[PDB]
Amino acid sequence: PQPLWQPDAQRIAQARITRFQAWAAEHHGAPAEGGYAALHRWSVDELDTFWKAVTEWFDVRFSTPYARVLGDRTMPGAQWFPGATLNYAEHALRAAGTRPDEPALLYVDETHEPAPVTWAELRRQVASLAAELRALGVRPGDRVSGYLPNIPQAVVALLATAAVGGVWTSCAPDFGARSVLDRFQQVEPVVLFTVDGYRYGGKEHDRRDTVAELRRELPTLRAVIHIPLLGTEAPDGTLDWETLTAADAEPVYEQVPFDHPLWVLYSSGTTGLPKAIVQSQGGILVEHLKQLGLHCDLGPGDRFFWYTSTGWMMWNFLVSGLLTGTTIVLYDGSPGFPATDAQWRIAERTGATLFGTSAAYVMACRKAGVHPARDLDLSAIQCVATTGSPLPPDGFRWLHDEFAAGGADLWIASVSGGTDVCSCFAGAVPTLPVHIGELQAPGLGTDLQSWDPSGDPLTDEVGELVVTNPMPSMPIRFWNDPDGSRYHDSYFDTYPGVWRHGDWITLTSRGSVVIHGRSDSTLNRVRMGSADIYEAVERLPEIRESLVIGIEYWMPLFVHLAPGATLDDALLDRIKRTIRVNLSPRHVPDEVIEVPGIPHTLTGKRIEVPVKRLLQGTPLDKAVNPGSIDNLDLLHFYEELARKRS
């Protein structure tokens, strides 16, 4: 297997993860030799010592000592650092004591004119707001909610919430009221931070009526804090943001147990109410430190820009950049406004050193004839990362060569972040080569395996992604989950005591990971992942997006066509051809059906399972939570299809 890219030996030697291994080998019995393969095996075989090592390396300061690193090891509900106390916000703001006048936040909107908030100023605003939250009666454990775009106020609010031991939960303001309420009503927040609207694509999006509706339908709220993004007056009964952040009193951080809830995230699952996933201050603290400082190589003074809505877990990951003393870049706006290269212009104007984006955006830039490294000053960029669908080899080459032609050797990273543990089970390692369509390795401390139906491990064979050991950022539990039934059914109902993620994967002999698709959405004719098929079909110019389903056996391919394209015999021939060639005859659809579009979750994930149910005759009204999908009418198309075929 020929790598797309191999890191040079000095880059390897200079990686923080390499320094960590050397230090761990001196002080904690880690292997000095053997590189990542050896470090990883140690991180799993000596799990307690590994996490101890992580906390020392990052100087996590427990205000009360832990009794041990790990008590009960069984899942779900493993017992991390029992006895210890800490505070996430306190750790995040440590750099205010070391480089107070450096920028902690660089924020920007569609004017593309960045503004800084210094570490000292961030610490002060957070302390002011935390004191106000305490005065409003927010106690440790109370939920504090936000209806907020990616603006510096959202970071200040989250940190202030964590500082008081409040439990953060948020939605972005492109969510409609039913989607927001389906989430927030489950956890009964006592505070709401909210904007009056936002700007996107050069257009104004008023949210005053939505805010009025949220307030009326959330009767547990006791205080509402208004952020006048569009410059409107605070509604009756609300507090004005600027009045709460202006004080200069001593920072105070609530020292909470390791397991104390930090935030509630919401699953993208489309059945029933969205799962309300609770993660701990301690678990997120150590896992995000590990990912950011070791897997992403981030440290003090770096500048981390991920293009993201606050409604995606990548925002939470971005916020945690502060934990490593890293400046974070916040952009509230469209990815292509005023022009296609907008995200690159932000990276330029903020001096980003790590720029995280989507493979789709990279490909769209290449297609549009953008040359970002040539035309902008991207000399500060050391790494470009994508999460979600993998960057194809022509995209990787373009990106790398675009920087390489100008004398820069770029690290192109592929990660796979998920809401469930607010991190990745597998993804990037700065010291390993990159291969087509692979995630480089399971993360440190993650015992990832591919299991057959009998629960035995496979190598170079497709199987179920399992994680056989506990990770600190795994959910404490789901909120609004009697008996813990939904949490159990989500991961623990297939192999006892083992986390089964629902991904159909290969774990290669080189220790890397290929994700073929969702296990519950495979095509069985031999069990095939749908991802492989989407890659092939969707390379065709005429096909904007596709969706493949298999039902007991009928295997139709739904295609949303590019403008001007027509589903003719020639097109059907090209479709079937590219499939039987690049994959196999088994992969060829029984039928191709043109569609007005492809329905998605709110986060833009394909919804194969709900569509399958519809095609199986389940009425739309009972198949999905409509607040959890992006286009009701598009989904109704598929119900009509089943009705027509009934």
Per-residue contact string for residues 224-263; x = within reach of Ca ion by CB under 5 A? ----------------------------------------
User: Taking the complex as a whole, how short is the minimal distance between the CB of residue 394 and Ca ion, in angstroms?
Assistant: 13
Task: Return the number of the residue (369 or 453) whose C-beta is nearest Ca ion.
Answer: 369
Task: Return the number of the residue (72 or 377) whose C-beta is nearest Ca ion.
Answer: 72
User: Taking the complex as a whole, how short is the minimal distance between the CB of residue 545 and Ca ion, in angstroms?
Assistant: 8
Number of Cβ within a 10 Å radius of residue 477? 17
Number of Cβ within a 10 Å radius of residue 628? 24
User: Taking the complex as a whole, how short is the minimal distance between the CB of residue 402 and Ca ion, in angstroms?
Assistant: 21
Q: Which stretch binds Ca ion (CB under 5 A): 135-143, 181-189, 469-477, 539-547?
A: 539-547
The angle formed by the CA atoms of residues 296, 76 and 390, to the nearest 5 degrees, is 35
As given in the structure block, the two tokens for residue 114 are: 């960045």
Task: Return the number of the residue (99 or 544) whose C-beta is nearest Ca ion.
Answer: 544
Q: Which stretch binds Ca ion (CB under 5 A): 8-16, 132-140, 258-266, 541-549?
A: 541-549
Q: Binding-site residue total for Ca ion (CB under 5 A)?
A: 4
User: Taking the complex as a whole, how short is the minimal distance between the CB of residue 236 and Ca ion, in angstroms?
Assistant: 48
**Angstrom distance (rounded) from CA 297 to CA 295:** 6
Q: Hey, what amino acid is at 601?
A: T
> What's the chain's Rg over C-alpha atoms?
24
Task: Return the number of the residue (7 or 589) whose C-beta is nearest Ca ion.
Answer: 589
Q: Kind of pairing, strands 239-240 and 223-227?
A: parallel
Task: Return the number of the residue (70 or 84) whose C-beta is nearest Ca ion.
Answer: 70
The yes or no reply on residue 392 touching Ca ion (CB under 5 A) is no
Task: Return the number of the residue (63 or 74) whose C-beta is nearest Ca ion.
Answer: 74
| Run of H or E residues at 382 | none
Task: Return the number of the residue (72 or 568) whose C-beta is nearest Ca ion.
Answer: 72
Q: Which stretch binds Ca ion (CB under 5 A): 68-76, 204-212, 376-384, 614-622?
A: 68-76
User: Taking the complex as a whole, how short is the minimal distance between the CB of residue 397 and Ca ion, in angstroms?
Assistant: 18
User: Taking the complex as a whole, how short is the minimal distance between the CB of residue 260 and Ca ion, in angstroms?
Assistant: 18
User: Taking the complex as a whole, how short is the minimal distance between the CB of residue 208 and Ca ion, in angstroms?
Assistant: 39
As given in the structure block, the two tokens for residue 111 are: 């004017």
Task: Return the number of the residue (64 or 74) whose C-beta is nearest Ca ion.
Answer: 74
- Let me know: does 383 contact 354? Beta carbons within 8 Å: yes
As given in the structure block, the two tokens for residue 40 are: 């990883």
Q: Which stretch binds Ca ion (CB under 5 A): 69-77, 163-171, 274-282, 605-613?
A: 69-77
The SS3 of residue 24 is: helix
The yes or no reply on residue 74 touching Ca ion (CB under 5 A) is yes
Q: Which stretch binds Ca ion (CB under 5 A): 77-85, 181-189, 324-332, 486-494?
A: 77-85
- Let me know: does 95 contact 104? Beta carbons within 8 Å: yes
Task: Return the number of the residue (392 or 626) whose C-beta is nearest Ca ion.
Answer: 392
Closest by CA position to 322, among listed 340, 337, 304, 306: 304
User: Taking the complex as a whole, how short is the minimal distance between the CB of residue 542 and Ca ion, in angstroms?
Assistant: 7
User: Taking the complex as a whole, how short is the minimal distance between the CB of residue 75 and Ca ion, in angstroms?
Assistant: 6
Residues 142-201 touching Ca ion, rule: CB under 5 A, are none
The yes or no reply on residue 77 touching Ca ion (CB under 5 A) is yes
Ramachandran area for residue 27 (φ above 0: left; ψ -120 to 50: alpha; else beta): alpha
Task: Return the number of the residue (204 or 568) whose C-beta is nearest Ca ion.
Answer: 568
Residue 451, CA distances (Å) to 458, 463, 515 in order:
6, 5, 13
Residue 221, CA distances (Å) to 88, 215, 216, 478 in order:
25, 7, 9, 21
Q: Which stretch binds Ca ion (CB under 5 A): 66-74, 174-182, 517-525, 630-638?
A: 66-74
Task: Return the number of the residue (79 or 480) whose C-beta is nearest Ca ion.
Answer: 79
**Angstrom distance (rounded) from CA 122 to CA 280:** 23
Residues 543-582 touching Ca ion, rule: CB under 5 A, are 543
Closest by CA position to 263, among listed 123, 419, 93: 419
The yes or no reply on residue 497 touching Ca ion (CB under 5 A) is no
Helices (H) and strands (E) in the chain, counts: 22, 30
Handedness of CA 38, 435, 446, 259 (dihedral sign): positive
Torsion of CA 231, 233, 234, 237, to 10 degrees: -170
**Angstrom distance (rounded) from CA 412 to CA 399:** 8
Positions touching Ca ion (CB under 5 A) are 72, 74, 77, 543
